[PDB]
Design a binder for this molecule. Structure first.
Ligand SMILES: Nc1nc2c(ncn2[C@@H]2O[C@H](COP(=O)(O)OP(=O)(O)O)[C@@H](O)[C@H]2O)c(=O)[nH]1
Length: 387
C-alpha cells in the first residue's frame, strides 16, 4: 500500500545526511592537514598539495549538498491539443489544478510543484512574487509558468514529484530542451479516437537523440469514447497497441515489445478526475461504463509510472555523486596514510617524538572516519542502487 515514490524521497534524505557528515569530515580533515603543513617544527609531514586537495574537496562537497537538496523527480506530458494532457495531470493530482485550455490557451509550459504553504500560487521567470493562481494565468525565447499547489492536498507533490504540461505538439523542438533534460519520464498523451501522428512521433525522436535512454509512456486517452462495445473495443485496442508498440520497440527502439506492455495504457482521464474530485461527498457519476476497468487501468499506470520514475530518478540524480564521494574518501585515506608514514619516518628526537605520535593518532582517527563514511556509502548503494 505504500507509494513507490517514497523510495526517492527516502533516498534523498539518506544521501543528504551522508553528504552533511561527509562535508563535516573533510572540513575537520582539512584543518588538520593545514595545521600539520603550517607547523614550523615539522619538515614536510603534510605538504601544500596535501592541503590544497583537501580544501578543494571541502569547497566541492559544500556545493554538492546544496544541489542534492534541490533535486526532485520530474515527469513531462505531451500531446496534441485536447488529447487530455492537462486532464491527466489533474487526475493524478485529484483536483482541477490546471484548467482545460493550457497550455494551448497560454502557449507555454506549466509545471506543478508542491508548496509547504496552504494557498496555491504562480511564479514566472526572472521574478519571485507569488501571483494568484490560474486566476492570473490565462495571461502570464521559451516560456514557463510554475504552478505551486498545497502539498497537503496531493500525495504526489508531497513526495517530491513535479509535473509539467507542454503546449501541445500541435513547433518547434530545440527550444523545449530548456525544460526537458531534467525530466525522468516523458509521457505521450494520445487521442484514442484518432491515431498516432508523426508530429507527435517527431518530438520524441529528438528526445531519443539527446537523452540516452529515456523512459517513455503512452497514454491513449479518451478511451471512454470507444466503450460499451466489447468486441469493437478489443479489436480497436489491438490496432492502437500495435502502432504504439511499433513506435516504442522499433522506431525509437528504446524498449523491447515485452517491457513495452508496461509502457502503454488505455485510459479516461476525465472519468478518473470526476471520480476523484467527488471525494467530499463520499459516487455519481462516470461517462460510458466500462468505467471500473478503465479506472483500474489508470491505477496500474500510476503504480508503474511511480515505480519507474522513482527508481530512474535515484540512479541518474544520485549515483554519480555517490561515486564522486567514494573517490574523494579514497584520496583522503591516502593523504592520512601519507601523513602517518611521514610521521613515523620522522620526516616526509626528544619531545618532537611526542608531537609526531599525536599527529599519527589524529590521522588514524581521521582515516578510521573515512572508513565509516565509506561504509555508509556502500550501505546506501546496497539499499538504493543495486544491482
Ligand atoms: N470524453 C473524454 N473527454 C476528455 C478526456 N480527457 C479530457 N477530455 C476533455 O477534452 C477537452 C480538453 O481536454 P484537456 O485536458 O483540457 O486537453 P489539453 O489541451 O491536452 O490539455 C475537455 O473537454 C476535457 O474534459 C477523456 O478521457 N474522455
Amino acid at each position: 500500500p505504500v507509494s513507490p515514490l517514497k523510495h526517492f524521497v527516502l533516498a534523498k534524505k539518506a544521501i543528504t545526511a551522508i553528504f552533511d557528515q561527509l562535508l563535516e569530515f573533510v572540513t575537520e580533515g582539512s584543518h588538520f592537514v593545514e595545521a600539520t603543513y603550517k607547523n614550523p617544527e615539522l619538515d614536510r609531514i603534510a605538504t601544500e598539495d596535501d592541503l590544497v586537495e583537501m580544501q578543494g574537496y571541502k569547497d566541492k562537497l559544500s556545493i554538492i549538498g546544496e544541489v542534492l537538496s534541490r533535486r526532485h523527480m520530474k515527469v513531462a506530458f505531451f500531446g496534441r491539443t485536447s488529447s487530455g494532457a492537462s486532464s491527466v495531470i489533474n487526475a493524478m493530482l485529484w483536483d482541477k489544478v490546471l484548467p482545460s485550455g493550457i497550455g494551448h490557451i497560454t502557449n507555454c509550459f506549466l509545471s506543478v510543484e508542491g508548496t509547504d504553504g496552504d494557498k496555491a500560487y504562480l511564479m514566472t521567470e526572472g521574478s519571485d512574487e507569488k501571483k494568484s493562481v490560474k486566476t492570473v494565468n490565462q495571461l502570464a525565447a521559451g516560456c514557463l509558468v510554475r504552478v505551486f499547489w498545497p502539498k497537503a492536498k496531493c500525495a504526489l507533490l508531497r513526495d517530491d514529484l513535479v509535473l509539467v504540461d507542454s503546449p501541445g505538439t500541435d513547433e518547434l523542438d530545440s527550444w523545449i530542451d530548456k525544460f526537458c533534460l531534467d525530466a525522468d519520464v516523458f509521457v505521450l498523451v494520445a487521442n484514442s479516437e484518432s491515431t498516432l501522428m508523426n508530429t507527435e512521433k517527431h518530438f520524441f525522436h529528438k528526445v531519443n537523440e539527446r537523452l540516452s535512454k529515456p523512459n517513455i509512456f503512452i497514454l491513449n486517452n479518451r478511451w471512454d469514447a470507444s466503450a460499451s462495445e466489447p468486441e469493437y473495443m478489443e479489436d480497436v485496442r489491438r490496432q492502437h497497441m500495435e502502432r504504439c508498440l511499433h513506435f516504442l520497440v522499433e522506431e525509437l527502439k528504446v524498449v523491447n515489445a515485452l517491457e513495452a506492455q508496461n509502457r502503454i495504457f488505455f485510459v479516461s482521464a476525465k472519468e478518473v478526475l470526476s471520480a476523484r474530485k467527488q471525494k467530499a461527498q463520499g459516487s455519481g457519476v462516470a461517462l460510458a461504463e466500462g468505467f471500473h476497468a478503465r479506472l483500474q487501468e489508470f491505477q496500474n499506470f500510476e503504480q508503474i509510472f511511480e515505480e519507474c520514475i522513482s527508481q530512474s530518478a535515484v540512479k541518474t540524480k544520485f549515483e554519480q555523486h555517490t561515486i564522486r564521494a567514494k573517490q574523494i574518501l579514497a584520496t583522503v585515506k591516502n593523504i592520512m596514510d601519507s601523513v602517518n608514514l611521514a610521521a613515523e619516518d620522522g620526516s616526509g628526537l626528544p619531545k618532537e617524538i611526542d608531537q609526531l605520535e599525536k599527529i599519527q593518532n589524529n590521522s588514524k582517527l581521521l582515516r578510521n572516519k573515512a572508513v565509516q563514511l565509506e561504509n555508509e556509502l556502500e550501505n546506501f548503494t546496497k539499499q538504493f542502487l543495486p544491482s
